[PDB]
Symmetry: D2
Subunit: 482 residues, 4 copies
Amino acid sequence: QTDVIVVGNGVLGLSVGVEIARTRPDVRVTLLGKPARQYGATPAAGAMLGAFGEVTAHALASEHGRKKHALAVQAQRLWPEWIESLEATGTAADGRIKTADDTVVLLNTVGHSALDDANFAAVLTALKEANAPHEEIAVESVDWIDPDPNSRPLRALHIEGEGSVDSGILLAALERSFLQAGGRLHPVDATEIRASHGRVEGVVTDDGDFLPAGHVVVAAGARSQRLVAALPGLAHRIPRIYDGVGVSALVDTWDGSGPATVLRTSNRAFACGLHLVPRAGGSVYIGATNAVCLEPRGAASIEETVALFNCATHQLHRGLNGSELRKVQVGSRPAPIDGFPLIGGTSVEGLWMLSGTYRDGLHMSPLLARHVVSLMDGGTGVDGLREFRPERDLISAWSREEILDDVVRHTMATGYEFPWRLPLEWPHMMETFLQGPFAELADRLSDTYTPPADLMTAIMFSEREQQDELIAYYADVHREWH
Amino acid sequence: VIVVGNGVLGLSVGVEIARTRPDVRVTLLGKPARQYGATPAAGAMLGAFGEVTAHALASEHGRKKHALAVQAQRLWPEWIESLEATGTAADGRIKTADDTVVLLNTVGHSALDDANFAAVLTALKEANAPHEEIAVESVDWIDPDPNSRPLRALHIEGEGSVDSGILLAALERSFLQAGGRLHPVDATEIRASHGRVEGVVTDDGDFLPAGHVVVAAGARSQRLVAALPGLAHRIPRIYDGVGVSALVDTWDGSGPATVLRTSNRAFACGLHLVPRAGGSVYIGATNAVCLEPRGAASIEETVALFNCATHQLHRGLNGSELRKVQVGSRPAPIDGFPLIGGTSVEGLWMLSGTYRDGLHMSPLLARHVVSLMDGGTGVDGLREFRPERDLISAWSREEILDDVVRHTMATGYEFPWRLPLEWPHMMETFLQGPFAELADRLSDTYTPPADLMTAIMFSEREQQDELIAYYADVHREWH
Amino acid sequence: QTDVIVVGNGVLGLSVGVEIARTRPDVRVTLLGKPARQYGATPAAGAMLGAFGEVTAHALASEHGRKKHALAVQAQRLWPEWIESLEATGTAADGRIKTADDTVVLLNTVGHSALDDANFAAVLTALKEANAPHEEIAVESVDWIDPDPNSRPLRALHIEGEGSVDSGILLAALERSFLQAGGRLHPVDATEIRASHGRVEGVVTDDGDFLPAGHVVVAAGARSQRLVAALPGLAHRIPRIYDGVGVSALVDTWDGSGPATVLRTSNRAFACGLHLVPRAGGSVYIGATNAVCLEPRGAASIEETVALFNCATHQLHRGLNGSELRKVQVGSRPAPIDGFPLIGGTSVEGLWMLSGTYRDGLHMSPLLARHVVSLMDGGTGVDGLREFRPERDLISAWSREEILDDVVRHTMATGYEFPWRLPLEWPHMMETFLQGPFAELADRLSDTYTPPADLMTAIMFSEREQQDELIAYYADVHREWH
Amino acid sequence: QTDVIVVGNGVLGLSVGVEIARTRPDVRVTLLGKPARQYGATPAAGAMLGAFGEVTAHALASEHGRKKHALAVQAQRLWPEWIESLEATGTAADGRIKTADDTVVLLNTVGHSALDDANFAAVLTALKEANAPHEEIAVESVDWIDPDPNSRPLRALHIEGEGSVDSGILLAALERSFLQAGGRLHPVDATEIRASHGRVEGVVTDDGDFLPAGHVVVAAGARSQRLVAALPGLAHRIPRIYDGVGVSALVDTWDGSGPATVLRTSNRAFACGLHLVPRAGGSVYIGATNAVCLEPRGAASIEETVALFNCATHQLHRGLNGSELRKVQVGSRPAPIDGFPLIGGTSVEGLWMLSGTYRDGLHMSPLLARHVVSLMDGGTGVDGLREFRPERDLISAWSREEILDDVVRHTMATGYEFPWRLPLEWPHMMETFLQGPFAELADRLSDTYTPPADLMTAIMFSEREQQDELIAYYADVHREWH
Ligand SMILES: Cc1cc2nc3c(=O)[nH]c(=O)nc-3n(C[C@H](O)[C@H](O)[C@H](O)COP(=O)(O)OP(=O)(O)OC[C@H]3O[C@@H](n4cnc5c(N)ncnc54)[C@H](O)[C@@H]3O)c2cc1C
Ligand SMILES: Cc1cc2nc3c(=O)[nH]c(=O)nc-3n(C[C@H](O)[C@H](O)[C@H](O)COP(=O)(O)OP(=O)(O)OC[C@H]3O[C@@H](n4cnc5c(N)ncnc54)[C@H](O)[C@@H]3O)c2cc1C
């Protein structure tokens, strides 16, 4: 066939489905996935069109991090026309995809100086280098916020043209745009990709059916590598993707008000962060926790709910304390084991992957969709996505020393972000006693690969059998690629 | 007979009527959504001794309410047997625990927690209830933060818990088995004339005729009857004691063998864990008196419930999965006591205003009202709690003003806050004047209990003025 | 006689004694006061040469406040030659009066936004208006500091040429300079100023002696008005001076190090503040608490010691935690009831006053000394110190409404500066319940006079009899002047 | 007659001096030490006549601990007649040695359950086994206390006949009683004990003099072993004594009141504890911190002052917050390296030691004095003090496993006693990461000796060179005794 099957109905699957359907009107594109969107990252997202807000000192200190940042800056330029093209298929009554145009990044002292101070400086530097319009503003000039004075910001950065979308209205607009362009929605899950003679034949679905295709695009979020790893050799050639389990909430504000901009901190301990995304109709979105889990989890923990609520009420608006909780949302950020996305072609003809985007796949979606569609048409797509090809040796973007410094810093940051109150000698004591055990873990896991801090903490506190299984995985990957 | 309401009280009275008068047709109103419903949000504890406070037992009305709770406990074993008998193994067990441990920690006000622990011990000794003060080290399962840990623990034997959801399912099943009819609509209006009930207009526009109407509509019960001539100032108002609770799947599927609880805390909230089947635990429960109904938890309520349970009961709950946040309205009577029995309108009955322990008292209250409807005298000590009455004044204005300041300070100590050491005394001195001024302004004769007085203090001027008018109209009607 | 008696041996008494002795070599000047310096402000002082560091929004919102600030800026220019003139009378072995040239003002969130944010902006504005050399600098560039990250500064302001002196070396240099200029030190206290026919005759001392004089200069710190109030009518003509009881400490640092600059916050709740003043020999000075007391107190409270130590260890340097406490110091800032100093002549011929300087008499001392000496010589002294003449109706520098707003703000700031951790509804509840009782107190005390916030809180929590005595005092002042 | 020199003027030196002078009319006794009492434990002590109040589960789990406890119970019986015999040499105007007859032990949650709950049970058990008069009482029945409700006791234990003395009045009474009995006070320090042919000749003093004697009793507190270690072989034969540096304070209460009983907790992290000892004249004593230091320290750290004040104001009486600080006191508890006292004779003829009594030498003083005086007269003194002879191999009273469990428990207790506020997973994480490094230190120090927890934490955080010097010391002790 020349038929295309997109496996997955998040932002990435639907974005690539829309681009394929619009640019190849001669081909039949079928998109799989159920309206429940189990473990789905996209429906749990605010979401911020985060490019500069996602900048950390640690990310920009590596070549792979600077490459990822460059792609985020490129994606931002596509959003205005992308939104126009999606709203064009609907009417006023469908709601607006865009919920804010601008972002304010706040700097408070409810966190580690080694993350928050370093990251604020890195955001300012990235904005200056990219010639992005921005201004450091008086905190008194930030509208709406009403923090606890002991939790208040002392610096604020207004980023112009870095905004937010309603993730639910975006998903509805993508489905509507996909159908308008001739796409077919088949609400079942793929169980298996069938291939032989190094070529895709199609997909077995969970209702027992077989769908033939010349092209299969896997955009199944955190399930994407588990689906492809079934094919010969690919188990140690496609980097593993884990569940970056994230908790967010929809709140009806006490007075129906909301801020005119996104409000956020820089990224905090183990890739969580605090933000408020404006919504229509007297609602605000607050996010968002992150915990890398070696198995999927579809429910918030008590700890996650309390940390999210406590940070938002103290650092953003005390009025949220008296506001009504409408929904606790949980989704899995696709967390790649080497810290970088899996975008492009495979050694299997007609097999494509769009996954492992962690915190900013939704932001990057229009760029990633256009990249993969260009490749499927025999083009070279977007420059700078080559290192993020899905079939690869694990990337080592940092030295083991850089990661060990990072994991101790992030561990200490879980204290400062709480925020804890301890005797003044205790933090230095904890730092000195954390270094040895993390160094020992890193040395034991592999002679060549080091997991990024977010994954390393999850491994440190996992069962012995899960640790031993990872040592075996790293050894098998090393064997395959060396 | 029409029963208006499908909580524990409506269904309990429906079951008793259907079982004891097989000759009469009983129809029970209410929707499966159970909007603002207290019963489905309840754990629930069969709380008699666990509900004891020094303040309650210092009043005659409080001691009378406590006596009825002790009496109700004796009915539960045969009541549960009679409800499970209409089902099979697959329906699950109503009883989830036989015993309760009351814990005393320092995450609260000495003026509430220390006084209330002593009052519970005294009530157990006076009632000859089986109990013993035990070593905290001997309490199984708990894993508190050491800075939030109990230093005293009290094991109460035969004071247990039921699964409120399995109880509601068992009551509906038992009601149908006894010939009851479930009509899933709400009453909009009780029709009466010549001082006699004719029946009920429903929200699908229909009219249902009846000689008897039993109102058990929880926090909506008085608003429904107040439409009838004169009754607006003769049936004490019932407000929403909005309560937040949660179902949690524990990290390891374990749970305690007993109820774990504190005594009642600031403005009639309290901390407890109720065992459930299938690796779930129930944690509760917040309380906030609202002058209007609210069906959603506030952020503050969720955080306080979770923070107290994780620190004071089990730190493992921190890593446990949140399955459900539950919200319900405890029917909060304006004079602090329930509304149980007959009316000046022939065939009009009320079962409401039970606040924290209607579910516990349900088998006793059901049998009381069914006896009255049969021309009996029901249960001896329920006469003062007749629904058509002047507002009860169970405490002096001075006792209530002391209580409201104590409870206000307890919201700090229960957080728990960390303040400069002069600040609490400063807050106490500056709280006394404004609460005394509010109490004096509201009425020359009536004083709302502390739980309601704080809600009135922080309500709009117009809501305060409407209450002054209500109290004046009640005084006019009864004096 | 043409003899001069200076009553008091603090910075003001000794500074005026030195200037009189140096400029009238024909007259005998005797200076009274004991080496114990009971309740003495000067020996408890760091001290900061604070002009811009003392700026608050509230002070600069009044004409009297702007006038006081102008005089502080003028005093700064006299310090270099004043220090030269004092060290000239000694040798290398006497040690250096100046301990730092520059000041860094730090902004953290361990306080009320309504004080700390407003005051930081006011300091920046005062520096810009005066064309003073200064720079807002990166907190990372502030040397030596090692704060708790949850208590850390996010903004820092370097003020050039605003420094510090060792108060003990200054007092020793002033005594030595006074003797070099022909002054006589008589270590007894004045019990009584004798006057008749509207003219000073001299001073009865506490050893029962009588010293004759044509001139008596009262610089007895917080005792100054109580001494002069004995003279006919002067009880209701010289504004009362109360004890601004201040606690400070000398600490030997863990490693003998100290910062190269003064480190300070702006003034905080009820005119306290946090600062570190460099000292020679591996010592640092930390200060300083403030509590207005209606009666003198010569000992620190436990609360004062804990608040001073807790703030310095968290907000400046955690290493101070392990440092050795050498001395807890207590002194009475002369706190004038109308908020302004008492400098110049009296209706009694030859009777002069130098007092009521509260937080910055030591800084202003060379200017105030030269002013009073000019007046004693028939000059007009320094322009703008005429409004601060000691014999006056009480100044009303602010509206009752401004003071009631200030006293509630400062009350709440005692919480935020602790810092407390409270349920988020409690602060607004406390603010609403504080307003009524402070308004009631202000209305009860007088129809015309309102005490500044620092004094109003002391009166609020004083005995009924002390309140009633103040109502009588205000009534008697009103009678005398209207 | 025959000369005796007592080296040291604390409770032990003066108690033995009084007993010798009273009982030995044949002997001339001279007692050395200065009125400054540098590093002196006794003047910094409250002091509690602590027998049952000093009970811990850990102490009573060892044979040596139970033996030490038995001696404390015996000492209590001597105090009434001892006090009579000392007050008899004075008049009413000298003041009363006894300040309280009874003690209340309070149990609150501002500490580790593994110390405070275990120790409360151990105190109850020791009282029941001894048939001591006591009762567990309602906290509401404890007079005077006004704790923060979040810091309040929930259990209280009244111990009858376990009281307190004023340490300053005791020292004055001992000096007066010593002089009345013919003792000579020579206010110089010993620099050197001279011996040859295995016999004491006398003492070189720090004024360069030599005093001849047949008998030298060393009771120089924490300096006792350093003084004798100069003599041949004795460096590895007299267990080292370190400085258990303790901070306490005298406070004038807001209203002149005080409690009628001692108020105390059981012993807390690394042998500190919280207590209030009644004093006459509107003063109370609060104590007391403890930190084992490898070198003497004569000044309180900021941390010590804050922890003492914070615990007393929260857990005992909030009124202490507004009370006046009269004195911060610092003294060195003589801390023996093997955890037990050094009482009795030496291999050097006429050389005796009374030291290493740590927390309860003052309580035991009448018993210890009578023991040593009996031995010096050719008696056998008190049964059960033989195991505490000063010339010995280091005692090993606990297994390495017991001490490693204890040191981790005590480390965690420094957090719970603060009290800290941390995320709920942090304590378990700290416990797991503390175990390895303490086990490694214990293994490195010696194959045979393990320092008790109080000393082990001091060694853990000492310089590498101090650790290496201790490894050498332990090796040299092993060589000498095996
Ligand atoms: C968080 C929480 C915890 C609790 N824990 C306990 C506990 O541990 N122990 C205990 O004994 N009790 C507990 N209770 C409940 C307490 O006992 C209540 O007083 C009791 O449940 C009230 O029962 P009810 O049947 O009167 O009211 P509800 O349970 O409110 O039932 C009233 C019903 O009437 C319906 N209704 C309303 N208007 C109409 C209408 N017009 N027509 C028809 N139907 C209508 C409502 O939708 C609702 O379903 C708890 C309650 C809450 C909220
Ligand atoms: C804060 C604190 C609280 C305490 N609380 C209690 C309590 O409640 N109950 C209790 O029973 N005990 C208490 N103690 C004391 C404890 O019992 C001690 O073990 C005991 O006081 C030790 O007495 P000592 O005479 O051996 O030593 P010290 O009291 O130290 O006396 C030794 C003396 O010898 C002098 N000296 C040193 N070197 C020389 C030299 N070369 N020549 C001459 N003199 C020299 C020193 O200057 C000093 O005065 C406390 C101690 C401290 C520090």
